[PDB]
C-alpha cells in the first residue's frame, strides 16, 4: 500500500 490505495 506504500505506492497505491
Amino acid at each position, epitope marked *: 500500500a*506504500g*505506492x*497505491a*490505495g
Partner: antibody, heavy 115, light 118 residues
Framework: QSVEESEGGLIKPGGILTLTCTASGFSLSSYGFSWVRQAPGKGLEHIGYLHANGRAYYATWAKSRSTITRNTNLNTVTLQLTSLTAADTATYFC???????????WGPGTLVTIS | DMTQTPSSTSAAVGGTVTINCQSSESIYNNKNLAWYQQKPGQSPRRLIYSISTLASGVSSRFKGSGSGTQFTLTISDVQCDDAATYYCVGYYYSGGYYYSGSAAYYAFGGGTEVVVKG
C-alpha cells in the same frame, strides 16, 4: 536479495534496446520496480515504473517508445526502448527506488552506448 | 517535477550543507520522498526515505525533513567522504479506481554536487 541488469554495449542509432533485470533471493513480482537511466555526466532520470499491481507507468518522454513487462515465471522485468539516438546513451538501472518502503534495491547498472 | 537547489555547493570539513527540493505537486501520501547519494562509477546509495527515516547503515549526521512540496537534506559535520552528488526523488500516484483511471511516476531532482574543502 539482489538484482542484475543484462548486458548493454554498443548499439546502432535507430535500433532497439532490450535489457533484462534478473532477481535473486526474492520475487520481483511482489514489488514495484522502475527503470532509471543516467546519461554520461548527467543526472538520474526515471523511465517507467512497473507497479506491484502489474500496471506499467511511463515518463511522458518514454511512453511512446518504451515497454516494461514482467516475467513472473523467470523472475525478470524487461525494458524495451525503441528508436534509439545518441541521447539514449546512458547507464541503465533496474531499481526499487524505495521512496517510502524499508526495501530499496538497485542493480549495478549497465552502460548502453549509441554511436 | 522536482527542482533541486543549489545545483553545486561546498563546505569546509566540519561544516554543514543544506540541499532543497521543491516538487510541483504534493508527493504521494505526503510521505514518499527519498534522498540518494551517488559517487562516480557507483550505484546510487539511499540515505533517507519517507522524508526523514534514515536508511540502514547511514550516519546520523544526514537529516531529512519537509512536507508537502518542500524538502531538505542537511549534512552535519561534513567529511571528505561526503563529497558526492545528491538527489531527491519523490513518488506520485493518483486515481486507482475504475472511473478515475490512474497515473504514477517518480521524479528525481536535478542533483547537487557537494565539494568538501579540506
Amino acid at each position: 536479495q539482489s538484482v542484475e541488469e543484462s548486458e548493454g554495449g554498443l548499439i546502432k542509432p535507430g535500433g532497439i534496446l532490450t535489457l533484462t533485470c534478473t532477481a535473486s533471493g526474492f520475487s520481483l513480482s511482489s514489488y514495484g520496480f522502475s527503470w532509471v537511466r543516467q546519461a554520461p555526466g548527467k543526472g538520474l532520470e526515471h523511465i517507467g515504473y512497473l507497479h506491484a499491481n502489474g500496471r506499467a507507468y511511463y515518463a511522458t518522454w518514454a511512453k511512446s517508445r518504451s515497454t516494461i513487462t514482467r516475467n513472473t515465471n523467470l523472475n525478470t522485468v524487461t525494458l524495451q526502448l525503441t528508436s534509439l539516438t545518441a541521447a539514449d546513451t546512458a547507464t541503465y538501472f533496474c531499481a526499487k527506488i524505495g521512496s517510502v518502503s524499508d526495501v530499496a534495491i538497485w542493480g549495478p547498472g549497465t552502460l548502453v552506448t549509441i554511436s | 517535477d522536482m527542482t533541486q537547489t543549489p545545483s553545486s555547493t561546498s563546505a569546509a570539513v566540519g561544516g554543514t550543507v543544506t540541499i532543497n527540493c521543491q516538487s510541483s505537486e504534493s508527493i504521494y501520501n505526503n510521505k514518499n520522498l527519498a534522498w540518494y547519494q551517488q559517487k562516480p562509477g557507483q550505484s546510487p546509495r539511499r540515505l533517507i526515505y519517507s522524508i526523514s527515516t534514515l536508511a540502514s547503515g547511514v550516519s546520523s549526521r544526514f537529516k531529512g525533513s519537509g512536507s508537502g512540496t518542500q524538502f531538505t537534506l542537511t549534512i552535519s559535520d561534513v567529511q571528505c567522504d561526503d563529497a558526492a552528488t545528491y538527489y531527491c526523488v519523490g513518488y506520485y500516484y493518483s486515481g486507482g479506481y475504475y472511473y478515475s483511471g490512474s497515473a504514477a511516476y517518480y521524479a528525481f531532482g536535478g542533483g547537487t554536487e557537494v565539494v568538501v574543502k579540506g
